[PDB]
Amino acid sequence: DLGALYLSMKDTEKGIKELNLEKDKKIFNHCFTGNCVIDWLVSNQSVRNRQEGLMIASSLLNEGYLQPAGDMSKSAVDGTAENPFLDNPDAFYYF
Numbered sequence: 319d320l321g322a323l324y325l326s327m328k329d330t331e332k333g334i335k336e337l338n339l340e341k342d343k344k345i346f347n348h349c350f351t352g353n354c355v356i357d358w359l360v361s362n363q364s365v366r367n368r369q370e371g372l373m374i375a376s377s378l379l380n381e382g383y384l385q386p387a388g389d390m391s392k393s394a395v396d397g398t399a400e401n402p403f404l405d406n407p408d409a410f411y412y413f
Contacts, residue, residue, distance in 0.1 A: 323364060323374075324383045327355070328413065334358050339412065349387055349412035352404045368405070376403040384411045 327333040339349030355378070359371035378384055379402050386392060386402070387410030394409070395402055403411075 320377055320381055320383070324378060327358070336413070346387060346410070346412045349410055351407045352391075352409045352411055353407055355384075355411070356405055372403070372405050376401075379403045379411065385413065386410070387412055 328336070330336070334348070334350060334354060336348045337350070339346040352375070355375045356368055356371040359365045359374055360368060365371035365374055375384075379386070384403075386395060388408070390406070391402075391404060391409040391411070394404060
């Protein structure tokens with residue numbers, strides 16, 4: 319279930335690296351990168367290859383679990399939303 323796995327990421331250590339990413343006047347609640355979720359998922363029993371963890375994470379955001387951050391991801395979901403989740407460090411994805 320996508321809801322179960324997502325909740326696992328929202329955990330403490332078992333999940334991703336929940337870290338408050340602050341900038342100027344905004345505090346990105348647990349802001350990370352796209353390639354991050356891929357490495358975490360791959361490190362777990364969910365997926366093995368980078369491709370497997372990439373498609374799984376794709377659904378996650380597609381459902382609205384994740385939240386895109388930056389102009390990169392904002393442009394990806396603008397035109398062709400065929401590929402919402404980006405496995406690049408340039409694209410941000412917080413909770």
